[PDB]
């Protein structure tokens, strides 16, 4: 009976995902614990086409976030539109999308929605790598308390401090229609590396007001505060002698975020739906960093404010149904970057009274418009769409006295097709226009080269999704041509150089109830995810034909879940092929361990859990192991000041506990 969908991202509804005309996967809270995950990257790596490397480089700590889609640069997750409840996660979405500080926590999420394809019309910028939305816990219908905790240790490591992550959830909605939930997640501890002491406090206040069935308000308040020592990389020599140690004693990072979000929804009938959402974030991210013969301090402040009205309406036009969607977003961001320093030879860390060699202020004003129309005709669902952005960015240098500006547009036309083969089998194809902005650090290069234009990408997908209840599976191909990247892939970036890369591959995954074969395998489930990704450099120059760095060709997982009665037994494997660390693709390892072939690997993990039941508070206990065989591996950081080798996670033991009231 014609019902308007409107926001298909939202809380990642199972049905919206199945009906999604493009590559898209979701992992829900219920499945976080099975692999002992407490961090975002641990869940993201379980999704095909996604590579979320262990802490390294600038982001050599838990406050940052590292991940890349289909071979796009993983460092500081700048190639995908990262959001939490639709709200921009970056402290500078347009000018500085690098998540050196990523104020979000797994413990406060109900799910992770990765939309690799089909979201370039409604979401941006940095949409070349699809969109990733972190869905926050829902306000319980009726008063509810949930608490959980996980503890980890690496026996073979010299680091004896454990790592603990906890989460608290208390909330409910009163009969008057007003509900609010307190979501808190925290992290205390060190990983398997020395100099990794960490503290993170993520506190949110989520509210919902539905006096009636037409008017609904929503609010989200968050206070994120953290700090962490940064292990850093090791040269080959130090790594061989002791791979747990840190030779970057000064490296430390800290930051905080204050967020306020308010929204309103007007739905008169099931055919019309209006939405307006406004937000404001204040961010302070700083840290000590050893740089050459000096130690630096880099305070950076950010202000982001946005407002977005959206409208959705369905109507019949003959035998076809049309759900037209229109949206508008105004976003304004402001920044201030400073860098203090002292001589390392001296015995004091830099402070506000130390001299500084950088004092810049940047900002962006963006106007985004989008229009799409979901047309249901027969078994088809064709969706043509158009997104348009007008961006104005500037960088003001107080030391040099310069002031630079760039003004450009990003027109992105798209078309996605969904064809329903059967009640439980879909087909989809699509193409979208994606773009990367002119980052603040690239404005100088942009104006000097006289070419101010967005980083442009054109994606194409073809895939299928299946679910007969006993077997769920999906497979699809993707093609991505990403041009005019201000970051060149040549060994030497020049003013006029522009990066150009191609990403092609296959993504797939499946889950099967083996109980349909024999009662001997009842409650026995098997699964696997896999992605063949070939990211290549097609920029004319000294690296043309080479492979994009940090992009394994093969990556995925396989596992079996056995749930007899109240028990849960998990077995899982993570694997990926090798990767290069630089654009030149050098095979031979350098003495500082910053460059050279990075081996692939295959790890095994297991876990045993028990659900006690309704009375003693649905108590959940568990013990598990990551990297059972203690298989040795490592990743590298190439360009940053703490570059070098980073020991991969060794055999790690963990315990989990959770209560629900």
DSSP 234: B
Q: How far apart are CA 412 and CA 391, in angstroms?
A: 14
Nearest to 78 by CA among 446, 394, 485: 485
- Report CA-CA distances (Å) from 179 to 86, 139, 364, 384, 504: 20, 7, 35, 37, 46
Nearest to 70 by CA among 655, 604, 477, 573: 477
Reduced to 3 states, what is the DSSP secondary structure of residue 362?
A: strand
Q: How far apart are CA 380 and CA 320, in angstroms?
A: 9
Return left, alpha or beta for 434; rule: phi > 0 is left, psi -120 to 50 is alpha, else beta: beta
For the four alpha carbons of 93, 98, 103 and 107, in that order, the dihedral sign comes to positive
For the four alpha carbons of 313, 314, 315 and 318, in that order, the dihedral sign comes to positive
CA 410 to chain centre: 23
For the four alpha carbons of 98, 65, 194 and 637, in that order, the dihedral sign comes to negative
Reduced to 3 states, what is the DSSP secondary structure of residue 552?
A: coil
Q: How far apart are CA 112 and CA 203, in angstroms?
A: 18
16: enclosing H helix or E strand:
helix 14-18
Q: How far apart are CA 147 and CA 410, in angstroms?
A: 45
- Report CA-CA distances (Å) from 458 to 127, 455, 652: 11, 11, 42
Q: How far apart are CA 170 and CA 183, in angstroms?
A: 7
Nearest to 593 by CA among 634, 549, 547, 556: 634
Return left, alpha or beta for 440; rule: phi > 0 is left, psi -120 to 50 is alpha, else beta: alpha
Q: How far apart are CA 253 and CA 244, in angstroms?
A: 19
Nearest to 342 by CA among 300, 299, 289: 289
For the four alpha carbons of 15, 20, 25 and 26, in that order, the dihedral sign comes to negative
Measured from the Cβ of residue 450, the count of other Cβ atoms closer than 10 Å reads 8
Q: How far apart are CA 83 and CA 114, in angstroms?
A: 10
Altogether, the residues listed in the chain come to a count of: 661
Measured from the Cβ of residue 387, the count of other Cβ atoms closer than 10 Å reads 26
Residue 159 near residue 191 (C-beta atoms within 8 A) = yes
The residue written with tokens 């409910």 in the block is: 172
Burial degree of 192 (CB within 10 A; 0-12, 13-18, 19+): buried
The backbone torsions φ and ψ at residue 487, rounded to the nearest 5 degrees and listed phi first, read -90, 115
Domains of the chain: 15-142 (2.170.130.10), 143-661 (2.40.170.20)
Longest dimension (CA), the chain: 79
Residue 118 near residue 19 (C-beta atoms within 8 A) = no
Residue 65 near residue 42 (C-beta atoms within 8 A) = no
Measured from the Cβ of residue 392, the count of other Cβ atoms closer than 10 Å reads 14
Residue 6 near residue 270 (C-beta atoms within 8 A) = no
DSSP string, 469-507: SSEEEEEEEEEEEEEEESS--SSS--SS--EEEEEEEEE
The backbone torsions φ and ψ at residue 447, rounded to the nearest 5 degrees and listed phi first, read -70, -35
Residues 6+ apart with CB under 8 A from 399: 357, 358, 359, 360
| Structure obtained using | X-ray
The backbone torsions φ and ψ at residue 163, rounded to the nearest 5 degrees and listed phi first, read -120, 125
């Amino acid at each position: 009976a014609l019902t308007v969908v409107g926001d298909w991202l939202g809380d990642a509804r199972e049905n919206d995902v199945f009906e999604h005309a493009g590559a898209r996967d979701v992992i829900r809270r219920e499945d976080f614990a099975k692999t002992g995950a407490t961090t975002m990257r641990e869940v993201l790596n379980r999704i095909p086409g996604v590579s979320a490397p262990e802490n390294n480089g600038t982001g050599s700590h838990d406050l940052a976030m590292n991940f890349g889609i289909r071979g796009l640069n993983p460092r500081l997750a700048s190639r995908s539109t990262v959001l939490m409840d639709g709200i921009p996660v970056p402290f500078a979405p347009y000018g500085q999308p690098q998540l050196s500080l990523a104020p979000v926590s797994l413990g406060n999420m109900d799910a992770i929605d990765v939309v690799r394809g089909g979201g370039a019309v409604r979401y941006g910028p940095q949409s070349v790598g699809g969109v990733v939305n972190f869905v926050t816990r829902a306000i319980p219908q009726d008063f509810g308390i949930e608490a959980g905790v996980e503890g980890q240790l690496s026996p073979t490591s010299s680091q004896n401090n454990p790592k603990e992550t906890h989460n608290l959830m208390v909330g409910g909605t009163a009969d008057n229609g007003f509900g609010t939930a307190l979501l808190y997640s925290g992290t205390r501890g060190s990983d398997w590396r020395e100099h990794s002491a960490t503290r993170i406090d993520d506190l949110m206040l989520k509210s919902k007001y539905a006096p009636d069935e037409v008017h609904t308000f929503n609010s989200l308040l968050q206070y994120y505060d953290g700090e962490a020592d940064m292990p850093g990389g090791l040269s080959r020599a130090d790594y061989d002698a002791d791979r747990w140690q840190s030779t970057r004693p000064y490296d430390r990072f800290w930051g905080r975020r204050k967020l306020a979000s308010l929204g309103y929804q007007f739905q008169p009938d099931s055919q019309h739906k209006f939405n307006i959402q406004g937000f404001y974030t204040q961010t302070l991210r700083s840290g000590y960093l050893e740089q050459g013969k000096r130690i630096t301090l880099s305070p950076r402040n950010y202000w982001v404010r946005g407002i977005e009205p959206r409208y959705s309406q369905i109507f019949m036009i003959g035998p076809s149904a049309h759900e037209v969607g229109v949206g508008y977003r105004y976003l304004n961001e402001s920044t201030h970057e400073m860098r203090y320093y002292t001589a390392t030879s001296s015995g004091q860390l830099p402070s506000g009274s130390s001299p500084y060699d950088r004092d810049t202020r940047s900002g962006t004003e963006a106007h985004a418009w989008y229009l799409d129309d979901k047309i249901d005709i027969g078994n088809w669902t064709i969706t043509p769409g158009m997104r348009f952005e007008h961006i104005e960015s500037y960088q003001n240098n107080a030391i040099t006295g310069t002031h630079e500006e760039v003004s450009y547009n990003a027109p992105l036309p798209a078309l996605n097709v969904l064809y329903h083969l059967t009640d439980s089998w879909n087909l989809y194809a699509n193409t979208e226009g994606s773009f990367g902005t002119v980052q603040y650090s690239q404005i100088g290069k942009a104006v000097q080269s006289g070419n101010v234009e967005p980083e442009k990408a054109r994606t194409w997908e073809l895939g299928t999704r299946y679910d007969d209840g006993a077997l769920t599976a999906e497979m699809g191909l993707f093609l991505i041509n990403f041009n005019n990247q201000y970051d060149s892939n040549q060994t030497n970036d020049t003013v006029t150089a522009r990066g150009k890369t191609r990403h092609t591959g296959l993504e797939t995954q499946a889950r099967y109830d083996l109980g349909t074969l024999t009662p001997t395998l009842d409650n026995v489930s098997i699964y696997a995810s896999y992605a063949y990704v070939n990211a290549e450099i097609r920029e004319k120059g000294d690296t043309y034909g080479n492979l994009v760095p940090f992009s394994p060709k093969h990556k995925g997982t396989l596992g079996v879940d056995y749930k007899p009665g109240n028990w849960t037994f998990n077995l899982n494997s993570d694997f990926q092929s090798s990767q290069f660390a630089d654009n030149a693709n050098t095979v031979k390892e350098s003495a500082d361990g910053s460059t050279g072939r990075i081996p692939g690997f295959m790890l095994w993990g297991a876990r045993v859990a028990y659900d006690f039941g309704p009375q003693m508070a649905d108590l959940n206990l568990a013990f598990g192991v990551k990297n059972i065989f203690d298989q040795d591996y490592f990743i590298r950081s190439y360009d940053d000041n703490n570059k070098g080798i980073y020991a991969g996670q060794p055999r790690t033991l963990y315990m989990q506990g959770s209560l629900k009231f």
